Design a protein around this ligand. Structure first.
Ligand SMILES: OC[C@H]1O[C@H](O)[C@@H](O)[C@@H](O)[C@@H]1O
Ligand SMILES: OC[C@H]1O[C@H](O)[C@@H](O)[C@@H](O)[C@@H]1O
Ligand SMILES: OC[C@H]1O[C@H](O)[C@@H](O)[C@@H](O)[C@@H]1O
Ligand SMILES: OC[C@H]1O[C@H](O)[C@@H](O)[C@@H](O)[C@@H]1O
Ligand SMILES: OC[C@H]1O[C@H](O)[C@@H](O)[C@@H](O)[C@@H]1O
Ligand SMILES: OC[C@H]1O[C@H](O)[C@@H](O)[C@@H](O)[C@@H]1O
Ligand SMILES: [Zn+2]
Ligand SMILES: [Zn+2]
Lengths: 140, 138
């Protein structure tokens, strides 16, 4: 394959998910309340349009629609205890155009992934009731 | 090229070793803070050593064996007497964990590499290691 995967950041709970790399990420939808509940990813994969449903369905959706020539070049957030579970409390992304988030209201251990060269092409991690952990595929 | 980071502050001057064929060793010089790093590596048939940061601190060496690669970097950055620098720095290989080295807490960062390896470094250096970033390959 030749994949580059960094992360996941967060807890060891939930069940592993892995969408693999995409030809093109179309949109990312972060479901969010006190904590990061979930992430939906809409993408094309070769060339068919699929959307994957990660984490849980609580919280409020916050959608990042990527325009033409717009790519994800950063991810940051925080993970910490929420009711006996270590999950992502905050999650944000930046693109080559704009910054998004963070979404979620629970402080914890910060992580940050500035990408000086390259971009995010896919996601993996762990999900249950909430988003326990999130990691990322990279490509040039 | 895949470059992630750098984590740290905006002081010092920019360094960039580029990607290596193979990392041979990493020597982290630290006391209160991360002072410097020596990286020994091969590159198109040549063996090279680069030094980043200053001359202070106590050395802690990571020597990588055959088929051993760097699969993680973690640390902390913060204001140490006027400059935002790496106060703690650690690495992990596919065999072993090292450090972190340095005694000054600040803002944590972590880079676990689920697939791929660290192949090189970039960042900023002066008296101490202001910032450190990493080249990644499969
Ligand atoms: O994020 C955890 C939780 O936070 C709040 O309690 C609400 O917004 C819920 O919908 C959500 O599931
Ligand atoms: O404004 C963003 C903000 O909106 C709501 O209050 C929640 O979904 C939060 O988790 C989120 O951070
Ligand atoms: O998502 C947080 C939490 O939700 C559920 O209770 C389970 O799936 C846990 O394993 C998981 O850690
Ligand atoms: O390395 C820490 C510090 O050392 C020197 O004082 C200068 O090179 C600064 O620019 C740098 O921030
Ligand atoms: O790390 C900063 C500083 O910490 C201590 O004072 C000593 O170990 C020095 O050698 C070093 O320069
Ligand atoms: O911070 C870890 C590291 O920092 C300095 O170099 C010294 O105090 C060492 O004894 C120690 O192992
Ligand atoms: Zn969904
Ligand atoms: Zn030695």
């Amino acid at each position: 394959n030749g994949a580059i995967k960094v992360g996941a950041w967060g807890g060891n709970g939930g069940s592993a998910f892995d969408m693999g790399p995409a030809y093109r990420i179309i949109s990312v939808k972060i479901f969010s309340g006190d904590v990061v509940d979930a992430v939906d990813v809409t993408f094309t994969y070769y060339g068919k349009t699929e959307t994957r449903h990660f984490g849980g369905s609580g919280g409020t959706p916050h959608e990042i629609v990527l325009q033409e020539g717009e790519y994800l070049v950063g991810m940051k957030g925080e993970f910490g205890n929420y009711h006996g579970v270590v999950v992502v409390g905050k999650l944000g992304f930046s693109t080559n155009k704009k910054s998004y988030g963070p979404f979620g209201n629970t402080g914890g251990t910060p992580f940050s992934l500035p990408i000086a060269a390259g971009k995010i092409s896919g996601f993996f991690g762990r999900g249950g009731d909430f988003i326990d952990a999130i990691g990322v595929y990279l490509e040039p």
